[PDB]
Automatic annotation (TrEMBL):
<feature type="binding site">
    <location>
        <position position="483"/>
    </location>
    <ligand>
        <name>methylcob(III)alamin</name>
    </ligand>
</feature>
<protein>
    <recommendedName>
        <fullName>Methionine synthase</fullName>
    </recommendedName>
</protein>
<feature type="binding site">
    <location>
        <position position="429"/>
    </location>
    <ligand>
        <name>cob(II)alamin 2</name>
    </ligand>
</feature>
<feature type="domain" description="B12-binding N-terminal">
    <location>
        <begin position="285"/>
        <end position="372"/>
    </location>
</feature>
<feature type="binding site">
    <location>
        <begin position="381"/>
        <end position="385"/>
    </location>
    <ligand>
        <name>methylcob(III)alamin</name>
    </ligand>
</feature>
<feature type="binding site">
    <location>
        <position position="384"/>
    </location>
    <ligand>
        <name>cob(II)alamin 2</name>
    </ligand>
</feature>
<comment type="similarity">
    <text>Belongs to the vitamin-B12 dependent methionine synthase family.</text>
</comment>
<feature type="binding site">
    <location>
        <position position="385"/>
    </location>
    <ligand>
        <name>methylcob(III)alamin</name>
    </ligand>
</feature>
<feature type="binding site">
    <location>
        <position position="98"/>
    </location>
    <ligand>
        <name>(6S)-5-methyl-5,6,7,8-tetrahydrofolate</name>
    </ligand>
</feature>
<feature type="binding site">
    <location>
        <position position="384"/>
    </location>
    <ligand>
        <name>cob(II)alamin 3</name>
    </ligand>
</feature>
<feature type="binding site">
    <location>
        <position position="154"/>
    </location>
    <ligand>
        <name>Zn(2+) 1</name>
    </ligand>
</feature>
<feature type="binding site">
    <location>
        <position position="381"/>
    </location>
    <ligand>
        <name>methylcob(III)alamin</name>
    </ligand>
</feature>
<feature type="binding site">
    <location>
        <position position="483"/>
    </location>
    <ligand>
        <name>cob(II)alamin 2</name>
    </ligand>
</feature>
<feature type="binding site">
    <location>
        <position position="207"/>
    </location>
    <ligand>
        <name>(6S)-5-methyl-5,6,7,8-tetrahydrofolate</name>
    </ligand>
</feature>
<feature type="binding site">
    <location>
        <position position="433"/>
    </location>
    <ligand>
        <name>cob(II)alamin 2</name>
    </ligand>
</feature>
<comment type="function">
    <text>Catalyzes the transfer of a methyl group from methyl-cobalamin to homocysteine, yielding enzyme-bound cob(I)alamin and methionine. Subsequently, remethylates the cofactor using methyltetrahydrofolate.</text>
</comment>
<feature type="binding site">
    <location>
        <position position="483"/>
    </location>
    <ligand>
        <name>cob(II)alamin 4</name>
    </ligand>
</feature>
Amino acid sequence: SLFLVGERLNATGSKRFREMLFARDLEGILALAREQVEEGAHALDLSVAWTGRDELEDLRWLLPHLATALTVPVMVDSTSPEAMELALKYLPGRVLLNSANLEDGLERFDRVASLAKAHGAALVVLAIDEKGMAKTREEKVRVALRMYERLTEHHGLRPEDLLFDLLTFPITQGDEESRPLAKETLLAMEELRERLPGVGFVLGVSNVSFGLKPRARRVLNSVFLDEARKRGLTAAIVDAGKILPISQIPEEAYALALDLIYDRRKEGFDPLLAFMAYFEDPGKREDAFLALPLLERLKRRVVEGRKQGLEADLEEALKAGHKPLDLINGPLLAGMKEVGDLFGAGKMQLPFVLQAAEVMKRAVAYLEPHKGTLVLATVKGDVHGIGKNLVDIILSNNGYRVVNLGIKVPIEEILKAVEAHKPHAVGMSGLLVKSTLVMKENLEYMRDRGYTLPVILGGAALTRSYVEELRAIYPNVYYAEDAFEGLRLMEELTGH
Ligand code: B12
Ligand SMILES: [Cl-]
Ligand SMILES: [Zn+2]
């Protein structure tokens, strides 16, 4: 076996741990810890970061009790090195620091590495640098080799004390950008095992499968964990519970998982859709679709995501004298809204949602030719691009114009693009906890400059309560818990 690291002592991540931390329930925490150890964990990932709380106070209370009471080492998961500094003092024995990246240059990287060197801790090294996330095999190797040279020579850390996180992206939303990102980590890990013998590799294996039903997640995580092990993986941040042995995985579900991990596309074979097909017949439902009356058949094109002969159905409508506005605002919008309903309820998964959007892209393409504007950015010091990109796709394919500023965007650059495009709203994403502070700060500035424009903050880490606290600063803020609340809020603020 591998050095498993337990993922449930996470305030943002785990709902149980969140509550227990907030209620100061030491014995409950310690139970969840021992539970994970029992399920196979060799160490534990502590993250007590959460919106509107002092991480350092929570740590000052919990760390002393854990030190006397835990069998396994702790992995300190904090963006703040101050937290890291504190923890190394309140937790003797073996330690692992989680992160050490070059996202914001050599200051925080060298800070964390010299901490690790001083207090004999292991280091996780994420492949994020000054130009962003290492998404390809070439990028991962380039960044990794730089960090290795730097930790081993400048900081004098031993290779054995370093765990490279070459980054686990979800491959379980439709987007063609994400298709090969699991493969690219895998092929990089193999390359770096050869180039850098001595070094650990760690992955947040659960990420590969984010935005899937727990049945399909367990499987995909397990298969991916295994492929990783065979390419150099030494450690893994997982739910010790939600991991099957490869033995307990049917040969079909196995082969499909592999097709998705390695992006094994062919004419008429979508890995992701096929893997989802399992876990939710074959010849029978096909015929049922063709039987539908066109009013509901055009609505089911949007809902099921059938762009296979969609141009043919869209003529039969216009041959009944139905106006192209009537088809867009009636059946095709009814379908889209229902995908919004289904996703907001938590029934539909993302890939079908994106094919829904792509059908409304191809439907407007045939009907209209022969709505408003949103300036969207991810805030300073946050590289989480995927959530915003989803919002881009949804609004784009429902008629809104989206100005996508990319990531790490400072308020000055946003307002520069507000002044140029005069949008109906500003969208700011950010999934990290410190990003919520950057949003507070930005609103303070926009209040200073005398703006009254709607600002939608869609970063996950956003208690509606804090958003109410932010209304004291800037009155026209909105929280979008999901990308669809985005589309609803753009409809309300333009009059649709
Ligand atoms: C895969 C992933 C990554 C990938 C990046 C993928 C990406 N987004 O580019 C990698 C591995 C590189 C990464 C890095 C890190 N991660 Co990360 N990541 C994740 C993960 C597992 C999923 C992200 C994802 O793609 N979600 C899928 C999308 C589709 O959902 P979403 O972005 O939340 O967006 C939805 C809504 O919020 C909304 N939305 C979001 N923004 C906006 C904006 C607008 C305007 C609107 C309308 C809507 C909207 O719409 C989307 C659809 O509903 C999350 C887990 C999670 N979300 O709980 C952790 C998570 C966000 N990561 C986190 C952390 C800390 C890190 C790291 C420091 C590493 C570490 N030590 O854990 C670095 C951050 C680097 C930096 N300084 O920026 C934490 C943040 C909490 C914290 N404060 O500590 C999380 C919660 C994990 C945890 N510890 O519980 N991560
Ligand atoms: Cl590069
Ligand atoms: Zn130094």
